Every structure is written in C-alpha cells, then in structure tokens.
C-alpha cells in the first residue's frame, strides 16, 4: 500500500474534511493503518484530526445522531 | 386506528427473546408481538422461528392501521434479527430502509462479570 500523507509533505490539518472523509468509514469509525497503509506518525496526526473535527462537528461520531 | 400510511418497525433482538414493536413515523407504538407470547416458552423463545411467528402475529394486528410501507430498526445481537425481516418481506410490506440501532457505548459503564 501507499501512505498519501507520505506522498505529500503534509502535516495533517483537521480542516480538510475532503481528505479526512477518506479515512472515516460510513459509520464514523476511524479506518486502521493496516487498511489505509498510512505511516504511524500520520496515523496519530490523523486520529487527532478526526477527533478534533468531531469536536467541531465537521465529522460525525456515529451515524445515529 | 388512525389510518396511518407508513410505519417504523423496531425489532428488539436480545439473546433470550425477540420483541417486535411496529410503530409509526412519529415514534409512538401501534402494535407489538413477542417471541415469548407466541406459544414458545423458555429456551424455545431463543430461536429464529419464534421471532418469525412474532413478526407474523405483529404484522397482523397492525392490519387495522393500514400500513403499506415500513422501515426496519433492529436492536440486539440475537438469534432472530434476520428471520423476522424475512417475515416482514413475506408479510406484505414495502421495506424502505433497514438500519442498526444496536447501542455501542464508547466504553462507559462497566459490564457484569457473568460466567464461570
């Protein structure tokens, strides 16, 4: 697999939900790094970005809201 | 009797029983039938067939409300949960969408310790 955050020179911001919605599933759950194949550092930055965007309601926690 | 059009079919599908509550869009109940009250008792409650007979004995006694189409909510990881919605395809209904309302806590309260 490939790590798209490694293909860029990025440091994951929590506001590009166009990219973060590629890493939530349709139940709101964060997709594993063995599935997406991201590096572990961008996986941690990814998880903090998902949870932060959930806090600002740019992403849902679940699908039963 | 109210002459309702569409309904929401909640199916509580625990291990020891399945109860089927057909309500309306609003969320207040029209009729229910359980896998215990259909003649099946004790361990025999915990079968998919008793859930199927439950969905039958709900799908009539909601005839007087005149429901053409219903959604299906299913809560509970039980032995029914699929035979009871085959028994709602077969009961003469139009299934709009099927959801899952099984409550998954982002682990909160502590579960019991039960087995040895």
């Amino acid at each position: 697999f490939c790590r798209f955050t490694a293909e860029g020179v990025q440091e994951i911001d929590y506001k590009d939900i166009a990219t973060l919605k590629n890493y939530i599933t349709e139940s709101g759950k964060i997709v594993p790094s063995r599935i997406t194949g991201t590096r572990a550092k961008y996986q941690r930055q990814l998880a903090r970005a998902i949870k932060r965007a959930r806090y600002l309601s740019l992403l849902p926690y679940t699908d039963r809201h | 009797r109210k002459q309702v059009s569409d309904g929401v079919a909640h199916i509580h599908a625990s291990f020891n029983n399945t109860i089927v509550t057909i309500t309306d869009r609003q969320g207040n109940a029209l009729g229910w039938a359980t896998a215990g009250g259909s003649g099946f008792r004790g361990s025999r409650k915990s079968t998919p067939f008793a859930a199927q007979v439950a969905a039958e004995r709900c799908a009539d006694a909601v005839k007087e409300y005149g429901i053409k189409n219903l959604e299906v909510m299913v809560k509970g990881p039980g032995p029914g949960r699929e035979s009871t919605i085959r028994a709602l395809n077969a009961a003469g209904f139009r299934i709009t969408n099927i959801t899952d309302v099984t409550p998954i806590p982002h682990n909160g309260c502590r579960p019991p310790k039960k087995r040895r």
Binding site: - | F15, S46, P48, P79, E82
Partner: protein, 55 residues
Amino acid sequence: MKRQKRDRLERAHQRGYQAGIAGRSKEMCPYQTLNQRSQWLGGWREAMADRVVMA
C-alpha cells in the same frame, strides 16, 4: 461388513461443519489433499453462518 460411507468427500464436509460450529476458528485441523480440504473448509464456512444464526 461393507465399505466406507461417502468416501471422505462429504464426510470431510460434516467434519468441517461440526468442527466449524464447535468453535475451532483455527481452520487448521483439515485434511491435506485438495478434494477433502476444500470442503472441510467449505463446511467450516457453512458453519460460521450457522454460528451467527444461533448463540
């Protein structure tokens, strides 16, 4: 005194089905020949669904 019943082909099926239901999520107690391993695993995966439908 007569000959073997269903010559390991669909006996290999029901061994994989009983072993599928009674746990054993190894899928690592089969035969080794192909025509019997294929449906030991066939009965195993037909037994996972029959474990989901019950307790």
